[PDB]
Every structure is written in C-alpha cells, then in structure tokens.
Design a binder for these strands. Sequence first.
RNA 1: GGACCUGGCGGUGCUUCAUAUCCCUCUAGAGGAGCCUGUUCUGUAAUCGAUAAACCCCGAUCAACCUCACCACCUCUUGCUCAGCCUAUAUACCGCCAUCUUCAGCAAACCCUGAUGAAGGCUACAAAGUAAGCGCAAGUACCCACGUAAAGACGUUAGGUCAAGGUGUAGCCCAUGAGGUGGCAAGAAAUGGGCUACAUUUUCUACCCCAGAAACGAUAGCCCUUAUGAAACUUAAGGGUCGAAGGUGGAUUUAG
Lengths: 88, 315, 101, 49, 79, 85, 195, 132, 517
Amino acid sequence: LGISIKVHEPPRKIERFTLLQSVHIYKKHRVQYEMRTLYRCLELEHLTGSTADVYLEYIQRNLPEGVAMEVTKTQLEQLPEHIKEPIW
Amino acid sequence: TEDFIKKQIEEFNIGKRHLANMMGEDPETFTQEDIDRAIAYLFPSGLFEKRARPVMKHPEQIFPRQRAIQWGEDGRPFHYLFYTGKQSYYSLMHDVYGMLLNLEKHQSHLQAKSGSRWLIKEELEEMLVEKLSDLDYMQFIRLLEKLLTSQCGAAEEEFVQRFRRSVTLESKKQLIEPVQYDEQGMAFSKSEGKRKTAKAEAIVYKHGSGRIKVNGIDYQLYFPITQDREQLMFPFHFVDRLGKHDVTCTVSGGGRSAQAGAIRLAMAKALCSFVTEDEVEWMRQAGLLTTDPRVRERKKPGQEGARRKFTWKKR
Amino acid sequence: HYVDWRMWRDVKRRKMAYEYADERLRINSLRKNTILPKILQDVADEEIAALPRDSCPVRIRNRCVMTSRPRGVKRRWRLSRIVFRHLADHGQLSGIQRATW
Amino acid sequence: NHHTYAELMQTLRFLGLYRDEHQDFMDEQKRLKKLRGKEKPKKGEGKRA
Amino acid sequence: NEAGFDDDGSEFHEHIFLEKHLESFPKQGPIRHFMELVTCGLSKNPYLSVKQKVEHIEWFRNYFNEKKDILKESNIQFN
Amino acid sequence: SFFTKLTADELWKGALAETGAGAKKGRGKRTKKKKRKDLNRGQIIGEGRYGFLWPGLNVPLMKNGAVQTIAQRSKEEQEKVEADM
Amino acid sequence: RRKALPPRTEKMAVDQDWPSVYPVAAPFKPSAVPLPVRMGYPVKKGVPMAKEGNLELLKIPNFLHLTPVAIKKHCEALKDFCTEWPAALDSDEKCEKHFPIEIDSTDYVSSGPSVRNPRARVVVLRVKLSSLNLDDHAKKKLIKLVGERYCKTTDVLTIKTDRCPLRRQNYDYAVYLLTVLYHESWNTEEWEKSK
Amino acid sequence: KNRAARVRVSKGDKPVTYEEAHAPHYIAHRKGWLSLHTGNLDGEDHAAERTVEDVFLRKFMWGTFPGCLADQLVLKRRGNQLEICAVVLRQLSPHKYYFLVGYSETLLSYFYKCPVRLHLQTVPSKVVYKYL
Amino acid sequence: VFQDDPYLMPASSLESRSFLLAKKSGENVAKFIINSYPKYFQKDIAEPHIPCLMPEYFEPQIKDISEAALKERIELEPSTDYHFQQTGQSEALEEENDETSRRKAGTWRAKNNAERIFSLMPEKNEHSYCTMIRGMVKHRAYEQALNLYTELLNNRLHADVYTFNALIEATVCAINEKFEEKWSKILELLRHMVAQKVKPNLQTFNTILKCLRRFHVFARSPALQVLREMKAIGIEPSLATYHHIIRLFDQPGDPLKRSSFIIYDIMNELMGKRFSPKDPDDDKFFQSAMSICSSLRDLELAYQVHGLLKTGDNWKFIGPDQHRNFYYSKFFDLICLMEQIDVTLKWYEDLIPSAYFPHSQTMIHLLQALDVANRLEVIPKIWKDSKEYGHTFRSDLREEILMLMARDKHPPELQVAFADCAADIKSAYESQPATSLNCIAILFLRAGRTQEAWKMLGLFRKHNKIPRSELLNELMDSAKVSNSPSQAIEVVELASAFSLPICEGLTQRVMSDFAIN
RNA sequence: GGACCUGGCGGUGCUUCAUAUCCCUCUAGAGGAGCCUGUUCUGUAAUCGAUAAACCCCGAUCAACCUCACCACCUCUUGCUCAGCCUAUAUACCGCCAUCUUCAGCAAACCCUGAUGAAGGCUACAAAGUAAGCGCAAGUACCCACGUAAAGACGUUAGGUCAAGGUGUAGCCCAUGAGGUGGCAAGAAAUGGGCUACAUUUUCUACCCCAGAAACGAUAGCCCUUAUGAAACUUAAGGGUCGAAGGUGGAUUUAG
Ligand SMILES: [Mg+2]
Ligand SMILES: [Mg+2]
Ligand SMILES: [Mg+2]
Ligand SMILES: [Mg+2]
Ligand SMILES: [Mg+2]
Ligand SMILES: [Mg+2]
Ligand SMILES: [Mg+2]
C-alpha cells in the first residue's frame, strides 16, 4: 500500500517473581514464575488522516488475541493564531 | 495399518495441491522447503520445542516403519536365520564373516598364485531396524577392524564404506581481517571483542608511535592501574610491535579489568591483518583469540548466593 | 451465601472507606499546613478523631478474592499465592510460565 | 459484588438450570446426618435440654 | 480512548484558569495563599471533572466562612 | 469463600479417601468401608426442581409441525416426579 | 437420537477460493480445512496427534484467513479512501521548512470491553527553534524562561502537558503555552535592566 | 516429591488426554495456555477482573453442561471478543446443543456486556492421548 | 447462523427449524430470567454502553398523576389497570396510543371503552374513528366503519386512509360476485380524496386489491389497476397488491400465462429494483413469479427472481420457511428438467445444498433429470437426505430412483448402481412392503452379484410375494446355467406356492433345469 | 522344636572410589560483646500448628487500630445471608510439598528354574530370560555442545499443613454462631539465625582511587524535627548529649 515502514526489535524484559512452594513450612524451596515480554515496533511515515485510518483499520480489524498495540501519531500544524505579532 | 499409510500419503499429496492452490502456485512446482515456509508462516505456534510444531512432511518420517511380515500364508519364514530372532543383524554378521573368509582365502591364494568414521549403535538400529545391545555392537565393530586391516579388494572397500560416515570439519583456523581503505586509510583494520558484559571495538594503525588512544583520550589517562597496562601490552609484546601502533579504540560497559580484557580481545582479533598467519596461530594457541566465557551466574533460591548454602545446622 | 466475617468486614471497610474520602481529604487539607494557624488544625484533629470507625483506608487489608488470606498475596492479580499457583500450574493465566530461567 | 454471584448460582441451582454438585453432595451428607438420628436442634432446644 | 468519556466538552481554559471561582476570598495574605494552593492543586488534577472541582471550592468557601470565630481570632480578616 | 465448589470426582476423592494412608498397612478393620455410588445418572438436561417445561430440553420441539410454548408444570406434577425419584 | 454426518472436507472441491472458505480470524473448526497437519509432542513409538480434538491447534491461531491474494483483493478494494503524500514533502528537511512543528498523540488497546487508558492523554509538543522570528534578547529570554524544556543540542523545545484528560485540550494548552511564551519573549520587563 | 495437576500413572488403564499428560514445567516447551489475553503484559490495566472472569466462566460453563465438555475451555480474548471453542461429547441431540449455545450466548453476552459467539468441535468420546 | 462442525449441521429443513427455535427459545427464557431478576445485570464494567444490555421495565413510578399513570400503566390486566385508573382518576384517553393499543390488548371490550370515551370525553373523533374502524375490521364491525367514515367527514377534518381502507377491505371481504362495486368504491374514494386534497395511500391500494382479487377468480384487473393507482402517485406499487395480482392471474390464467406475465410485470415495476420496502408481502410476488416461470418454463422471470434473490437486494428471499422452500424447489425442478447437466449440478450445489434437502417430488424430479443425463451414482446420498427429510416417501423415492438400475443390465462400470441398490435395499427394508421387496429383488438380479442376487431372492421369497415372470425366467436361467437346478425349483415351487400364474411354464423350466440341465 | 526364603542389621570380610568431599590439606565465618528477629518458661483474663537430620526474620512479600482465630464486659437470637462454626480428629482426605533423591531403578504380560515351597532368573569366545509403560538418559530457557536452571519414577517417615480453601467422622446451632470498647506483644532465665564491630590493608575531607590529616565502632537510653495514619506507646528518616562492652572467641563446626 506504499507506507514505507522499517522493522526493529527493542530488547526484552523478563519479569521474574517468586512464591512459596509449600503451604505450612518449607522455606528453602521456592517456585519461580517467569514473565517474558517481547518488543516489535514499526515506524509508519508520510501519510494523511484518511490513509492512516485505512492502515490502522487494516491492523485493528486483524489484531490477534495475544499481542498489544500502542498508536502514536506525529501530526502537523502550521502556526498558532495570536503568535504572529501579538499583544495578548 | 498399511492402509493408513496409503491414506496419509494421499492426504499429504492433496494437501500439497491445496497449499499450491491457496498459495497460487502450480502443484507441479510447490516443493517441500516451500511447504515448510508456507505452513510455518500459516500456523505460528509459540513453543520452544521443535517437535511440538505444526508438522506436515513426507509421512514416512511422521509414521514409524511397520515391519515386513516374514511369512506368507503357509507360515514359513522367508529369511534363513529368522529363528534366532535377530535375523538382520546376524545375517549381516554372517555375510561379513563370509567377506573376511574369502578375503583370507584371497590372501593365502595371493601367496599361492603369485576423515571418515564409524557409525554408532543407534545409527545401526536406524539402518537395519532391529534392536541391539552394546557388546554385540562392539564385537561387530571389532570384526570390521579385522576386515579393514587385510589386503581387501575395492568391492570390500565399498562394502565397509557402507558403514562409514563423514566427519565434520576440524577447521578452526583464525580469520584474517581485510585491510580496508576509508579516505586514504592506510595501515588500518578493525575487529570487535567481548568479555564480562563489555563491548569493545579496537582499531589497529601500523603507522603510529607506541601508545594507545581510547575514545580520543590517552590510555594512560584512561588506565591508572598497571595490571590493565600489562593486559594491553600482552599481544603487542607478543608480536614485537610495541612502537608501531598509535591506535584509537572504543569500549562500552563494565569495570577496569572488564574493559581491559575486552579491548585486549579486540586488538588481538584486529592485529591478524598486519602479521604473518603463523603469528596469530601462535597467539591463538597462546590463548589470545577467544572469548573468556566466565560470566557470573545467577543466584539460586534457598541459598546465600549462587553457590553458598545457608548455615544449615545439623542439631 | 457468604459464610465469613473477616472477609466480609474487609469489604465493609472498603465500602465505608469509599464513602468517607473527600471529607477526610478536606480535614487533612486543614491539617498539613504551616500556614493557617494551630487552632484550626486542632479542631480539625478533633473532627477527624471524632469520625466513626471503619472509615479510614488505614484499615485496608489486601486479602484474596478466592480464599481470603491476609498474607502471601499478589496485588497484581488480587489473590493468594496458593490459588494463583493452582491456576498457573494448570496453565490458564497467559504469559505466566514456570521459570526455567 | 460477590454476593450477587452467590445468589445468582443459588437461584440457578434452585431453578435446576445449574447442576451444583457441591450442594448436592452437601445435602446428601446432611440427609444422612438427619437420617442417622443426630440432626440440628430446634430454635429453643440445645444445651438447656 | 477518548470516545464517549469526554469531561463534558470543557475547554482547556476551564481547567487552567480557575480565577472565575474565587470571588468571596481576600487578596494578599495567608488564606488567599492557601486558596491559591488548593486552586493550583485542582489545576493539575486530571482525575476530577471541573464540576467536582468547583464543588470542593464551594465546600472550602462554606467551611472557611462557617467557623468565623477562630478566623476572626486569627488577627487577620478573611473575606 | 464461595468459589471453592468443585467437580464431582474431586468431591468423591475428598470424601472417599481411597488413595490415602489407610489402605497400605491395613490401618482399619475392613468391616468399616464406604462405597462410591453415582450421582449423575438420572437428571436430564433441563430438569428444574420446579416443574419446568422446555421445547428444547424436556419435550421435543415440533408438535406434529408446530412449536410448543414456554410453560411450567403445576405443583402436584412436581410431587409426582419427586415420588418417582 | 443418533445421527451421522460427514464433513465438508470431501464436499469442497479443489478450486474453491479461501476468502469464501476462511474469511476472517477463526477459532479453527477442523471441518472446513482440507490440510492434514499434525501438532503435538508425540509418543516414542507413535504419532503426533491430528487436527481432530487438537486443542493445541485451538490455542494457536492459524493465518489461513489472511490469504495473500485475498489480502490483495481487500487492498485493491481499499484504494478509494486514500490520498497522496505530496511529492514536494518527501525529503524531510523540506517538510520541516514547510512544517516545523510536530504534535504527538497516544492511543492503546486493551483486552476486554473497557476502553479507558490513563497514559493516553499526553500530547508532547516538539518545536525546532530555528524556524521562528526570535530576536536576540527574545531568544535569550525564552531559554531563561523554559529552562530545561528545550534540548540545547539539536534545538528542539519539548513541552509536555497532562493537566487535563483530553488530547485536543492539552494540545490547545501547549499551543497556548507557546503563544504566551512568544508573547513574553519580546517584552523586556522592568527588572531585566537589573540583570 | 512434586505433584502438580499432572497425571500419576498407576497402571496402563487410565485414558488421559494431551493436556493432563503434561506437567507445568513443560508450558513454554510442550503445551499451550488455555486462555490468552494481554492483561499479563506490561503495561496493561484490568488484570484481576480478567482472571475472575475466566475462572467464573470456566466453572459456569462446566457446571451448566453436565458432562458435555471433553476438555476444559479455550477462551481466546480480543477486546470485544470472548470466543468459545470447546470439545463436546457426541452423546446428545444437536437441537439441545443449539438451545444451550444460544443460552450461553445470551447469558454471557448480557452478564459481561460483550459480544460472544460460541463455537464447538464435537468429539465422539473422551479424547485420549495416553493410557497413562 | 448455525455451526459448521460436522455433527451439528442440519440435514433437513425440520432440523434447521428446531435448531433456530431452540436458539430463540433459549433466548426467550434467557430474557425471562433477566426480567425476573433485574437487579443482577446492572453492575457495568464496559465503558461505551451498547444499549441492549439493560433489561426492560413494566412498573409504574407515578400513581397520583392521571395521564402519566395511564400512559405508564398501558404503553410502558395492565390495559385494564390503565382503563380503570382512567375511569376513576378522571384521566382522559387520547386519540393516540390508547385505541389501537387497547384494541391489540383487548376485541369488543376495547370498542366498548372507546365508545364510552367518545360519548364521555370530547376528543377529535376523526383519528379515533380511523383507529376504531381499523379495530372494527378485526372486531368484525362494518356499520361502525360507515359511521366512522361519516364522523371523519363531518368531524371538521379530512379522513385518513385507515378508516376508508378498513371499510373497503372488510366490505369487499364477503363480496358476492361484485364486479362493479369495487370500481364504485374506488371512484367514490377518488372523489373523497379530491375533496380531501391529498394522495391516495398504498394501504388502501393493497387492501382493496387483495379484497377485489379474492372476490372473483379473474378479478386481478381491478387489483392491478389499484397497484397502478399507487404507481401513479410518485411512489411505486407495493409487492402485496402485485402478489394478489399474480395469485388471481395464476388461478384464472390456466390456458394463457400472459396475464400472469402482466401481473409479473406489475411486480417487476413494483419490486424489480433495489428493494425500497413498503410491502406487507415483498416475498410472495417474487416466489409466485418464480413458480409461474418454473411451471411454464420461462427462463426470463426465473433469472429475474434469481438475480433479485440475494445479490442486489436480499428482501426477495424468504419471509416464511415455505417461501425459501417453494422458490428453491420450483427453480431447481425447472433447472433440472429444462436445462442441461451443468445447471443441474449447479442446482445440486446451490439450491439443495444451499438450502436443506429436497422434497419428495423434488427428489423424483432430481432422479428423472439424472436419468436423462445418466447419473445414478449419488442417488443414495440424496436418498438418505430424503429419508432424513421424509418419513413416508423414502419407499417411493428409493424404488423410483433404483428402477433405472433395476432395468439396466450389468455393465462392468455399473457397480455404483448396484451399491445404490444395496444401500436403498437396507434403508428401505430397515426403516419401517411388497413393491419395494420385488424391486430390490429385480435390482440385485440386474446387479451382477451372485451373493446379492441370492440374498435378494432369499429375502423376497418370504415377503408374501414371489418375483415377476421375467425375474423368474432369469433366475431359472442362472440356476440351470449354474449346473444346479435349486433356484429354478424354488422359483417354480414358489410361483405355484404363492398362487402366482407362472406355474406350467415355470415348472417346465424347473424340469428342464433338473433333467435337461 | 528342626531346616529354609526375603529384607534389615553387623564396633562384618575383600577390592575400588568419594572432588566440597572422609580425612591431611586452602579460603571466609559462627560460638566471645551490643542489637534485631523466632523457641521453652514466668506474670497477666490472655492466641493457633511445626520444634532431629527433613524447625526456627517459621505459615508472614507485614500482630500500633481491621490484621485479633486470646479473653473480660454490654448484647442479638432466621439470630443474618434457603443457615453457619477458626469445635476435637493431616490417625478420614483432596490439594501443596520436605528428606532419602547431589539417584537408577520401578515395572503390566509371558516363559523358565527350584522334584510345581516361600522364592530366583547373573557369565558377549555368553549356561533363560524376553519384555509394553514411568523415570534417568534423550530433550527445553539462560551466553552454544560446557555449565546453570528445570524435571526427578515407585515407595520411606500414620512426615507437615482439617487456622491456603473444600471435605468424611463426632459436637454447638435462644451456641462453640454473630455485633461493639479494653487490654494480650514485657521479661525471672536460657535459646537458633542475621547485622555491627573488636583496628593501622585502619577512620575522615574532597577526588572515584599519584593528595592530605588522624598513629576503631555504635545499639539502647535522652531532648527536638520530618514522613503516613482518626491515634507514635516499635514502625521510617534527619540534628545534638553521653555513648556502655567488644582489644578477633575454646571444646564444636558451617559454606565453597
Ligand atoms: Mg556472597
Ligand atoms: Mg524436587
Ligand atoms: Mg469463632
Ligand atoms: Mg493431624
Ligand atoms: Mg531427563
Ligand atoms: Mg529437580
Ligand atoms: Mg504435625
């Protein structure tokens, strides 16, 4: 669709916490649970609002059940109003 | 259970057809490596064990081999040594002692008429499918060694070459860095190195006086400790080029000995480009051209830390 | 059917704390000021110690929603280390696996 | 609001839409306990009889 | 994520400039400093709606003119 | 406190105790024994304890080419099926 | 009582298109697939389990719905909502010369019908300072005024705003802050001589 | 001696499925998670609600359908999707099954306020992987 | 709407019927368990509030008010409570939400309360008279519709189409050979609307059209004229008046289907585009059009209803289950007995497989069309579909399918015909039978299977009926040319033992098999 | 009573090993002083269970007020949830595990030998054992193949936990159920573990180690302030007063 992205991987995080294994008293033996979190970003460049709605819809109508999504658009604007030659 | 093998082979074939249909290719060209690519993309399993994958292959690897029936309707065994149970292994042993006996006959009648490796026991029971032990395997191997010593003809060379294999490379020779030319860059090379959570990229410059620069600033100002200075002199003392290298370097992460050893490894890997190959061969067997694997291991729970138990009283 | 009173009283404290939030907020706004001199803060202290019990979030005990145990609790999923280990060893809570490091 | 869950399952068992095996087993053991001869005292009977 | 939950169409200046709720209060002194502190506290709070913020504002006004005995014992006049 | 109502075989493993320590050394007289009977043989789906009539669970749906209505039996029919049980 | 029905696996012919077969993201009923793929840790003298009863195939999603030709069909039907990034605005220096002010947004997703996200209300404003009509005392005053909010190296003033939970409201707030900063940069006050 | 929810083989007489025959030290290796949701990733809110919804959902779906689950549920989860695909015994009428599928659709979709479509994969018996 | 999985699919339309009614009856008892406990589904966790998630309320919150209590007790025994609170709380009924609402609720008593409110409360009796005439069509009252039209004309307002349309419909209900009375009613209503200065309705057009078309057998002309009178307003005709037009064109158009084509063209102007729906029956016109084109072999209107079926606008599919069944059956029988084998295979993929299984005459048309194109291989799957569909026509479908396999000889490539014979034999003896047994005997005789022929003879010889004489001579030939006269002896002794007339020739064949063979 | 089989045991024999290991060896610590946190006991009206390997900053990743299962006093009996119980039984259990286990065995079905007895089934130049399944091994994550993690079968201690949660056996249910204020947690005396030190390789100012000066460590207790709380009697932090005794610890050991 002519969007011109790259593919890139941020380094991982592993959340590792620890619980007691027994119920009354055996402290020296614990059970660890991992929590692996991977990271996979894309940089979506040079598109307008309507086209961003196209490709964002074509992701978010095909979004899986295990992955996440964070949308951060960098929008455009020319000039504030009373900033040209202002006195309040 | 043979009929199940027929049904599985035709299902694998028509699934190949439907994979070529959904992938838009011809059923005449859609091959096994492309089959693996397509089914590997189409079903993303999140597992670490590769046998727990979505698998669609040549089904004779997927199905274990159903054994051939040794008797017809009259019930007679087809093979002569069937009644020892281990028919195939003992048949093979009989044939190999026959090859050795006619080879001894050929040596006596020659006086009268004048890299590779063995299999393992598991590979043998893969080949001849019939279970064995280890002492009978070893006896078979020792018979093969008595085969391989005699004046054996080329047919017998092929016959022992049936149970020979191909070893890997013992090819661990060091890697030369190419001499690079970046904007009149003469006497230049590079390498990388890593020891103890520390990355270091050193540059060699064969046109400079005897000192080291690190990130521009001098290695005396970078190293106040003499141990690190011996650590940097070590390869250059080994190649006798103490005054031939004013060099710039980079390092990131870790403490004094960590960054020192990482820069030493980077300089060692880099200096291959301006020496004889025997220099880095000797350096490598002096212990230079390798990564030190000693990274500190995690702590194991229920202990003080990483090896030390708590003060468990006995009483 | 609920059977118990330690769990039910912790839910009691939670809801009566949810009620008495902005009033204690205004009283402690009267408290922590170097401006607004002492006697106003002291009648604020009279007021807030005169409030009924089960009305402050000091009393809040983050117990389990499956077995009501006060201790050995994850605040990430609001239940006990036993029952979380139960449903984790069965394999339902996503991402949580047993750590092979 | 856990009491809504409890009373929800209580009515669904009472309407026979949920099959609450724990309460079937508990009324079975209570049935045996009243069947033996050691049932609950009445409101007004107890230690004072 | 702003769909339907919209803080009832308030402008930014209805969040920032809260001088429009501070009529019956003095000008230079300790208590107007206290009111500037609670006004700028409710300024930087985006977990409350502007209506709730004016509700706390009127509670402070009602309370600070309710107990005028010690506030006129305070040797400074509160409006 | 409520969500520990479990499956049927777990209730029978709890109360029966036929993998416990008493089996191995013969730790009781064998005359003390409690057998295990089945609780889930005779309740069809949509067996309400009230007399509930269903065109999808109780009674078949197309009454000779017509649907029946959602209804509920009387009290003495509930007494009849209780006496049947 | 008891019935017996075969699947559609024999029924569907060889050339049926997969958008008609698997349109959308499926929980994978294995009645419709004609592909015989096994998954499982198999037993030693046995087989991996087939697709029937395969809960491992139910937890793992197939990508069979995303037929690449059907991806292409949905793309060419989605040609209509498009615009064009105008060709004067491809090299990014020219895009800064025509638009040097960038406003960022934040949006996320969540498992569950609840939609709200607390971290989705900040709109960080990013202005490269070399496009403005700032005079010398004025630029010196803007630096003294913002302090640490302006990256000195690549000349990017960055202003964060989260004092109100709406994106457009904080965006107008950062624009108002820039507007009153560029009110203030010109004006030399009374004590600025008492420097 | 660690005993999880795993199978402790007594004789070659216990028909066991694929799921029960793997111990939770195999989960990242040889198994798959029953539910799947983004509530355990960071950052994400609304976690304990997702867990109580899954636990109540599975206990309800089992205790309602008497013996009509060959295994536990699959609760895939995507925003406004609570997608049910379970494995049922080929014992009862499909008319009654569609009655109960619509029943669970209506009750869950009005209780947890979310679009739910059920799916079933009928199995003729208890599914077996091992006689362990 | 159903699952795709193999065990729970429907195989008959009764299966889909009970599936969908199982779904909706679970939904109904689900909404009943919701409104019996409204305090259990109120805790909201979803933010954007899909509006179907809260229960509905039948309670009154106002008692001391009068009109709010009447509206909140009727429109929100409940109609009796609204009426009693209106009669004892001085609460005047309106001309809206009360007359037709209590008429659908409760219908002579609603008329009695309406008349007491008309003589008791001073409402404008024009719209109340319109709703009273519309209720009087269903409370069986005509002179009240005459008084309602008179009171609407004299009530200082213009009359609605409701009162006059109810009068026209319920008065042309029992029209005893009236052929000009409908034209006089339409002309007097035309003068009435020219005195009312508004266009005539679609409701009066459809009502007078159905009530005139059911009055005579060939009175579709005035009904189609009413459809055209709606068509000359600026809006198109409804498909219900055109449906009555095609229905009265199909009864009296027996020797000529051109008037059926004329009423079909009225529907094609009325529903032959994108469905702009205002019809009460927008499916009957297209179903009757397909039935006319399939009973007259007109491959234009069948294509018209098929392209209008579900691609452009899918209003033209089914209101009932019978609409889908009739349209699919007619188009499938026409495409099977009129078109070639490719379209019949398309019918087997796209009407019988797109809907549920075929009917009995539909299966006979499928079997005859397959015998035209020589396809008796998938007769057993459709036979199982028919026996799963029909409890009585399986014996009449299996033998009528297997006669062409029972009368064609053993080819080497005709083993599927014998397998169809064997499966129909097991299904036709096993389900719930003289002709079926004799047809199974002749079919397994024509099969070419020795054990199957002997088993069909040993099964049919005790069905109180011996075989036919051609079957008897074929069995005697297969005995005597087997060097074993046992079956010839059995055929002769049974045709003398079942009181059959094949006695002398069959016994001569038996003696020839014994002595001459 | 005579003979015999299996297991245990021998301060029982021969041979070979033990790689943190049995010693001779190597390093750093405990026991000697102060404090903190647990155990038995005393007082009080004052909690519950473990207490040898395999128990002691235990269940607790949290007892000032809920955390209170401990009691005194004032009360309630659909008492509150179609009841409930933290009442006695881990010697009715499910469930979770500790040691053996830092292993290599366990083992359904046959066959054979002991005259067809309990029982046993081992010699590769091979005299009867073969064998489905579990486990080890093979395999998975961390930096690979090393190593670590993880798994570790069946049985052992009626091992521990009916106060994670449910549950059978027995008891209360106008109470052993339930609502409120108060105190129970301070030491006669020992006692396991942890921290701090007992100096000159040391202490302090800056510098992250090219300097200089001085030839140690702080509890408790005392006054004040700050943090949270409705409340500082102990909880957390900061300033000041003096700062006890320890001048490197013996039988005995701990870990690598
Ligand atoms: Mg250490
Ligand atoms: Mg273990
Ligand atoms: Mg108690
Ligand atoms: Mg005990
Ligand atoms: Mg292993
Ligand atoms: Mg282990
Ligand atoms: Mg104990």
